[PDB]
Amino acid sequence: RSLANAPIMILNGPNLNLLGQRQPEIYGSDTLADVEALCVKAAAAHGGTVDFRQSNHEGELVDWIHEARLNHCGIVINPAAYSHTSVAILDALNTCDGLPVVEVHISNIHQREPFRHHSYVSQRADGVVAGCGVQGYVFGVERIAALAG
Amino acid sequence: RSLANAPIMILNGPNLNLLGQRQPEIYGSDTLADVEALCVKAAAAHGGTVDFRQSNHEGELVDWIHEARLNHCGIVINPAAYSHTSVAILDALNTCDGLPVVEVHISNIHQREPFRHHSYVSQRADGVVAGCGVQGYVFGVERIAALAG
Amino acid sequence: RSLANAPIMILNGPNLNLLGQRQPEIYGSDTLADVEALCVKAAAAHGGTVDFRQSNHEGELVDWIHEARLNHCGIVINPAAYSHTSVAILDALNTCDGLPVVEVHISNIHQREPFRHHSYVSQRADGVVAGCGVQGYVFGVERIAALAG
Amino acid sequence: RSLANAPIMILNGPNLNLLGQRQPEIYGSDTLADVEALCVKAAAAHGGTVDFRQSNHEGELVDWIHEARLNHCGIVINPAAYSHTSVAILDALNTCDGLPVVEVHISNIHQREPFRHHSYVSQRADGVVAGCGVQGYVFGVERIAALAG
Amino acid sequence: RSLANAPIMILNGPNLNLLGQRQPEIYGSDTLADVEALCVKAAAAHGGTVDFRQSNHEGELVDWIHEARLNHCGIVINPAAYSHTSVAILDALNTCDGLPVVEVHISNIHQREPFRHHSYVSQRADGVVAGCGVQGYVFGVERIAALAG
Amino acid sequence: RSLANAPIMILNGPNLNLLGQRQPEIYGSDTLADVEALCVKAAAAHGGTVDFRQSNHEGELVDWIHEARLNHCGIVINPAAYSHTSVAILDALNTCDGLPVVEVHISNIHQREPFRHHSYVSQRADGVVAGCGVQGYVFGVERIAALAG
Amino acid sequence: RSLANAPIMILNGPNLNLLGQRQPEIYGSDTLADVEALCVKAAAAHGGTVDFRQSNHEGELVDWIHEARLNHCGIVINPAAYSHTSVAILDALNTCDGLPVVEVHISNIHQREPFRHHSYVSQRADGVVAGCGVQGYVFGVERIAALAG
Amino acid sequence: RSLANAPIMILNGPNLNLLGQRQPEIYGSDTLADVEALCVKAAAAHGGTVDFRQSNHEGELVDWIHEARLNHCGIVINPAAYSHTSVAILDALNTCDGLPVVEVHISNIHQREPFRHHSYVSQRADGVVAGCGVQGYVFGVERIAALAG
Amino acid sequence: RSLANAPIMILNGPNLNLLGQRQPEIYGSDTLADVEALCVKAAAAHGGTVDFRQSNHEGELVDWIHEARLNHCGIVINPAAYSHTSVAILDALNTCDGLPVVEVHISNIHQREPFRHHSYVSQRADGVVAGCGVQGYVFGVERIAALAG
Amino acid sequence: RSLANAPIMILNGPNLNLLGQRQPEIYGSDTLADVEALCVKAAAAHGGTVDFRQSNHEGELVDWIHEARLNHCGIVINPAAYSHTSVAILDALNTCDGLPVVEVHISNIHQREPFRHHSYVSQRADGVVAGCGVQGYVFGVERIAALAG
Amino acid sequence: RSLANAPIMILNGPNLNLLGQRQPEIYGSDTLADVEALCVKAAAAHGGTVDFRQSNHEGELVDWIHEARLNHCGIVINPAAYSHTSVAILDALNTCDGLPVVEVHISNIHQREPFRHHSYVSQRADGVVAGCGVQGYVFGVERIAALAG
Amino acid sequence: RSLANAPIMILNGPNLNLLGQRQPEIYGSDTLADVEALCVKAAAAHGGTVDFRQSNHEGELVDWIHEARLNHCGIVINPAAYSHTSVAILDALNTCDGLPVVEVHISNIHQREPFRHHSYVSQRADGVVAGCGVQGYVFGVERIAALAG
Ligand SMILES: O=C(O)[C@]1(O)C[C@H](CCCOc2ccccc2)[C@@H](O)[C@H](O)C1
Ligand SMILES: O=C(O)[C@]1(O)C[C@H](CCCOc2ccccc2)[C@@H](O)[C@H](O)C1
Ligand SMILES: O=C(O)[C@]1(O)C[C@H](CCCOc2ccccc2)[C@@H](O)[C@H](O)C1
Ligand SMILES: O=C(O)[C@]1(O)C[C@H](CCCOc2ccccc2)[C@@H](O)[C@H](O)C1
Ligand SMILES: O=C(O)[C@]1(O)C[C@H](CCCOc2ccccc2)[C@@H](O)[C@H](O)C1
Ligand SMILES: O=C(O)[C@]1(O)C[C@H](CCCOc2ccccc2)[C@@H](O)[C@H](O)C1
Ligand SMILES: O=C(O)[C@]1(O)C[C@H](CCCOc2ccccc2)[C@@H](O)[C@H](O)C1
């Protein structure tokens, strides 16, 4: 699918509903709603739209990836903690043959606790953006626009 | 419980809803419905019935194992990604005292990425079948029939 | 929040709904309902009340932690299997700035299988109690009572 | 080769000559001769025949694998202790281009000592069946029948 | 022995004689004397008494455990550094067949340096309390009273 | 410095002089000169300029980071093989107090050989972009513009 | 069986046929026939006899262990290199229910190359003697004589 | 020194004072006094004498090794828990140039918990006897008598 | 011995009998007989002869090494799978004091599966040639010629 | 405290009483009395004194650290074997807030056995000197003199 | 390119300029000029020439590999210490599509320190010769002649 | 060479040119020129002179080490980041047969990031001084003056 004909799915994992409410030195002072606004703008800038979602449930994320697989032009995903633990989410993305996927982390996980350094999602994501703040979501959109082109 | 008196629960974990839609060289071109049909036949051949279910949700699979513990003669389980990650499903199966459990993987996980080599479920499953394709499910049923009688 | 003004949230993870039904040499013969009753009395003995919940779903536990963050005076959590696998629950507890958290394991996980020895939750929990049976929940409540005053 | 034209090679590694004489809780009370008779019946149930062999010598098993490579329709192998140590048997099976191979362990090796968890043979065996008792051999023959036709 | 007929041995390992003199954000500002008074009070509240001792010598602590084995109703031990290094103290506790043992750490060691995460003592201690401050000694006493009655 | 007052230093490590000449499926068919041209355009589109350089020599890269520290508004760096090996470049970037740094990899290093998964540079770079092709350089320029401007 | 009624089997693994021909500072100057003579002497001192064998073939050692199981009052084994590699010999000793087994190493393997530090045979051998020179075989014989009476 | 002119020092590490009082299936029913008596007679059987000591204190054991270095013809040492932890006792034995040293474990430490499998003392001890019960002390005396005569 | 007075022993490990019959991209399409013929001419070109042998049996290879130790001027060995598993063959080659030993692998084992990267034989072989095709045997012969001259 | 007002404590761990009686190539021919004299001299050159002590007992060393914390101007310590094993001594030193501490090893521990490479003391010691011979203690005195002024 | 039309590049890494000046029992007494003469002779015997170079600088070796890629018929490389550390040289070699590469080490790195056992270079070199002294360069030349033909 | 006859080479690795410009709490406020001046006076205090140099290039440091080998009486080296990565600098120092070498780190590397704990240079450096600040250079010079003496 192209940007013109289907939205980009923007998926957000656990706890990100609280973005902005603490640790601004690490994650900024923008809320999740502010991030959504940034993505709407960035997609529009490239002639597309987004479908922006958040969940604390691993299985829900899986279901939403199966939906993206049939209905969206690409996925930008910040899997949050499930980055480090979910093989299920990796396998869900693996079923998205041909679909552009960009993983985003607001923080630079490489500078944090050792368990945070690894991501299962990175094994499928076409591109991985870490430590660019909420601007990383914009880069995710920009990359999908380039690929679904 | 005997096969005569209660169904075999066949549980399928995340992403197996899409079986048949990709990677046929590894997983075959049969769909999950085709697998269900195979299981119905295999169980009938032995005078039993099946209760075949699939979920992308770890917690729903746990709930379902608690249901089998009370109501079913055995479990054949393809835990999918959760094989590698879910201590909660191992613990659920551990509550099934005396119930036959056979774990099944369509692919030979030992020939895949190193993180797929290990399974928590195998620590409780009475038998583990991997790399026998969808026929593995029929072996699961055949084992439970031998054990539940 | 003080004990006087808000309940203590007591969370229980997967499989603990079946407490009492097996392995009494390790977990005791009290049911989860008995445990809730113990907690109610322990909280009362210190001028408090509890909000006692159990779920097999990792996402629901996260959702509940976010509720406690805003509405409760502390958390006593037995994360069960999710102790060993859930970065998502660790992250949820980490959003609870200032809130007292005590992690409770009925069994002494240090005497069990190697994978049980480690807990993500212990990275945030203020106190960790293990192997004190269900009395551990009483210690959790007594700790929150000491800290939330 | 088909089942019609050539036997299934069934190979058994060291110590399995003493099967039935101890540890019946783990390995059953059937003797290796009883297993051979089970395999003859299982293969006949699918229009085939077997060539059933046992040796304590790694190099003899490699020799027999080379024989199967040219003269048999598939291999069912319980490599016993060599499963865990023999790169030579792995390399021998690797020479069997296109031949169906199923590895069988009577016990569920994933429940035993840590060194028993890993198998070189599993890196080539199409299918691996563990913890299904001597019925595993039946499943091995069933799989070969399905593949060799 | 019961609480009524013999004292609880409370053992404290190296450097704890200086408790209260530094790092109060981690260990609080109570002195060891203050901790002893807390233990006296807690034991009295359950009809018991304590025998409170501290040593910087691993072999003295071993001697004292042998004494408790014969003369006391239980042991509450904060082995301090020796928690991480002393198989000898673990072996001594292992000689105390039937005796209740609770291990206490004032700080939550799981949040500290990696070498502090593991304790040999926790392989024998019935219960392990970490990060509850000096109130963890009170939990120790409460647990022994529960078990020794 | 701001973008208006100083150029962005764009540094490329060993072997990137041959970009475009092989493995286009991984690295694209743009040459390093093409990438320079993209960076110059990207910077201009945010009111800045670039100082683009490539070297095969670890100590020359260190020298050039010292120069950036004093004369440039930020560093975009693709350290190539030295990402995995060079503590010296990490130390060099550490001296750049307050300067924005973005590391870029054309390929998704997390999908490649295990030694390629780790980067010393990511321990200082503010943001890390991987697998977004040459467009990742544009993202680096965009990030620096956001941080400097 | 007792010493009176059956010989002690003494088994020597690969390369021990050349004992005494090299490295005397490590292994001594006695030949394997001198070792056999020491064993004959030791057993006679205790009213027994020995059946002393050496082989370079793992499968042959397995076969001889099966013989001892049925025909000898105990096994003294120097498995040589196969100590470090042979799960098959371990499994063969494991079949020897009730039979006294002592493992002997002429050199102190714990002082040599790290791969020599571990032995699979020590997981079953009742006693293990290392670094006592050829007098270790004598200690072997003495141990069997104590146990087989 | 020879057996004729000086005693063999026999050192016993922590907790062995309690030998005989528990776990007889592992350690036997002999007391440490019984073992001292066994040693007196085994030395006399070879024209020697012994100086038999036990301590729970690592430094005392090092002090006694210094004394033996100057005053005794050999050392038989069961270091108990300190086998696994004490570099200080390894360094002490290392000062005993030319003195025969035999390490003894009553139990076969290679069949116990993993941390018990390794011994620092084995890095110097000339010989190491494990799993021969208290007879292992006799073998230690026998070896010293052979070396020091 | 010299090349003039004795043959070079050229030993080939398990499965090499089948060289030529598969995977020519890795191993070439020469048969083992063709390699033998290459060896004969390489040795003659330096005034020597060969004794060329192949076995699937570890023990036989050991026995043949003992023969070469007394009867031949050097050993060129491709231990095949046993390169990775056989301490026994290492120890056999260690008995060959002063005899030139060159290890050969047709394929570059360092580019293959991780378990293939390590060889016990290389701990004794004077020289190790890998990935030079069957020409590597020729280099082996050339090296023996150089050393035995 | 200044050098003018209190002595420097010089602590030596186990086995150093024997310094100079062996292994001169590693540790020199000076005795521990010679080392004391060198410290007296070095301290006097800087207007100070020393309190020079040696013990084989970990607990005594801890006791002496507590003494120094209150009574001395700094600590030079060669912990000997306890360097590698004693978290208790590290903890003792950690209580010496603000006190200068320099760790000395006569040998370069980095060139010795792997277990010797690591030191717990180095985690606190302000400075660590290894492989400078007995002259390392003069450097420790010189560093205390610099810091304590 | 063929040997007739272009020289073989022979590259030597750090410190090899001092070959011959020490450790002759490991590296021989030939100087690097002697090695160059051996390479000139061996190439001439096959109708070719060499371009022999040595550098202590990693980046200069990379530069020279790039030169070879365009101008030479093959590379024989002794990367010396950079074998073990340089992903940059590996990457340089990887750009040499279709070019024969042979890696040489004069000493048998597998008999040396553990860090020396691994080479990045070997992941690309076609052939790797180790432990054959300076004759290994001759094998390198002989291999390139065979492949360039 | 003696101190009287030739300068001590004092070599500084990458980034040290910026000493004094940041992180004074770890590295002090002296600049590299101030260090040089300190070394000049230290050497003069012992009748010697210094040749003080700094480079960011690994190969240049190796070249300088070869120069020292022929022309200088010793080496004091702070390899900075190359401590942790440069086998090349180790190998160069290894060529300096008989030459005294002391490694200096201004910061105590053992208290920093885990990768900084290890130094290849320390495998050859006779002495290693860490965490003594710039005074560590003076210790180096003092040690050289003692050894060249
Ligand atoms: O930095 C990221 O984007 C992460 O994906 C965020 C996760 C944390 C999710 C919650 O983020 C919040 C940040 C601030 C306030 C509330 C939630 C963490 O598990 C990953 O390791 C990195
Ligand atoms: O081979 C299996 O049965 C697995 O359990 C399947 C999982 C993947 C489930 C998704 O399977 C599909 C296969 C084809 C098409 C769609 C999904 C995988 O994570 C395990 O490692 C092995
Ligand atoms: O000991 C605990 O409380 C645990 O948190 C319990 C978990 C298991 C929960 C299920 O517990 C039951 C106990 C008795 C009967 C049924 C379930 C386990 O996964 C952790 O490793 C330790
Ligand atoms: O469970 C299996 O089939 C095994 O392949 C059996 C092997 C042991 C073979 C000997 O089996 C006997 C069973 C009963 C009685 C005697 C021998 C063991 O090494 C593997 O770990 C798993
Ligand atoms: O947190 C605990 O209770 C510990 O057991 C205390 C030990 C430290 C004993 C010294 O404690 C002091 C605390 C404050 C002031 C002085 C000493 C430490 O080694 C363990 O890792 C955890
Ligand atoms: O993907 C990247 O940008 C890297 O930084 C590139 C490096 C290789 C630089 C040379 O790349 C070329 C690509 C195409 C053609 C020639 C060189 C590789 O060492 C890193 O692992 C990832
Ligand atoms: O020390 C031993 O007895 C060994 O078992 C001997 C084996 C070596 C058998 C060959 O022994 C010889 C000794 C001297 C001369 C020839 C062979 C070795 O692989 C084990 O690690 C230790």
Ligand SMILES: O=C(O)[C@]1(O)C[C@H](CCCOc2ccccc2)[C@@H](O)[C@H](O)C1
């Ligand atoms: O590459 C080599 O020469 C090996 O020594 C060959 C062995 C494989 C032997 C069988 O070789 C064949 C090759 C082609 C066709 C048949 C057998 C393998 O185990 C080693 O890892 C490396």
Ligand SMILES: O=C(O)[C@]1(O)C[C@H](CCCOc2ccccc2)[C@@H](O)[C@H](O)C1
């Ligand atoms: O090199 C040192 O100073 C040590 O701290 C000394 C210890 C050994 C103490 C005994 O030193 C002696 C030297 C000569 C003679 C007797 C003892 C050792 O455990 C450390 O690894 C390094």
Ligand SMILES: O=C(O)[C@]1(O)C[C@H](CCCOc2ccccc2)[C@@H](O)[C@H](O)C1
């Ligand atoms: O054995 C080889 O050729 C090496 O590549 C040599 C390197 C060292 C080259 C310096 O060699 C010299 C040998 C003698 C005299 C001077 C330098 C070493 O780092 C590798 O681990 C193995």
Ligand SMILES: O=C(O)[C@]1(O)C[C@H](CCCOc2ccccc2)[C@@H](O)[C@H](O)C1
């Ligand atoms: O403590 C040291 O001397 C170090 O060798 C310095 C290196 C850092 C070199 C740059 O140091 C500067 C210090 C202050 C200001 C600028 C640079 C670091 O990589 C080592 O791990 C430890």
